[PDB]
């Protein structure tokens, strides 16, 4: 869109979008990019499709790395979570008297 | 006004408007020449060493400062 994507339309589809633009990228090595808020907002608006519109991590209450590590350690699994082999067998110790 | 920033922590002698002497470690000053002197001993006239402590001398009553000793360690 010529109006919404004003800053990025010039360099959106280049091989390395802003390689020789010394303002945004340090040089030809193409590292340490510095951007501006308008172009970042434009990029976010364009990339709304690939990004989950989640504001905080409270969605991953029991569905994050810590919970999955706990499930693997406890030989059990969250319904949505993955199933692992037991961390330690404890076949005889699994069912105590 | 570096002419008395040259004199900070030097043990200075301050002759006052009544004639009293303030021998104290020159810690601070301002635009009104109010001095902060620490461990200040008053010398009056025979001479004596009435210890005071941290004297905030108002600038109105200060006549003349002069160094007594080098700054301590």
């Amino acid at each position: 869109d010529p109006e919404e994507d004003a800053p990025v339309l010039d360099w959106f589809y280049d091989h390395q979008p802003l390689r020789d633009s010394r303002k945004y990228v340090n040089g030809s090595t193409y590292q340490r990019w510095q951007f501006t808020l308008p172009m970042m907002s434009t990029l976010y608006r364009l990339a709304n499709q690939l990004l989950t519109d989640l504001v905080d991590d409270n969605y991953f209450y029991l569905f994050d790395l810590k919970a999955f590590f706990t499930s693997k350690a406890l030989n059990m699994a969250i319904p949505g979570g993955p199933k692992f082999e037991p961390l330690v067998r404890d076949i005889n110790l699994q069912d105590e008297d | 006004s570096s002419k008395m920033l040259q004199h900070i922590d030097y043990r200075m002698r301050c002759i006052l408007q009544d004639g009293r002497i303030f021998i104290g470690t020159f810690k601070a000053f301002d635009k009104h020449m109010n001095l902060i002197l620490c461990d200040c001993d008053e010398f009056r006239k025979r001479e004596e060493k009435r210890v005071l402590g941290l004297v905030l001398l108002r600038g109105e009553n200060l006549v003349s400062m002069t160094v007594e000793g080098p700054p301590p360690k």
Partner: protein, 97 residues
């Protein structure tokens, strides 16, 4: 100063945005190192979906958790570079094709 320019709302939106899209500047990562669907399977599986897609979700989560848990710090290295001693040797030539 006016209360809010046309960039104020965009910046406020950029505040609560995913990790790539909430940085004014940043470093450059290889295209290999950019999982575009990592956050896709890190969420709960949508309802009304078949069994196969769900098992795919748990399997992706299992592989991700195994990668994260068995991560080790990179070993100290003397930085010997490939493709850099080749051009030093009198056997390789550089071009652009």
């Amino acid at each position: 100063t006016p209360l809010y320019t046309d960039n104020t709302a965009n910046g406020i939106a950029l505040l609560w945005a995913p990790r790539p899209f909430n940085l004014r500047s940043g470093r450059t990562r290889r295209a290999l190192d950019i999982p575009l669907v990592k956050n896709w399977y890190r969420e709960h599986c949508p309802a009304g979906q078949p069994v196969k897609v769900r098992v795919s979700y748990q399997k992706l989560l299992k592989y991700y958790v195994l990668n994260a848990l068995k991560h080790r710090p990179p070993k100290a290295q003397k930085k010997r570079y490939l493709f850099r001693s080749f051009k030093a040797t009198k056997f390789f030539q550089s071009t652009k094709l």
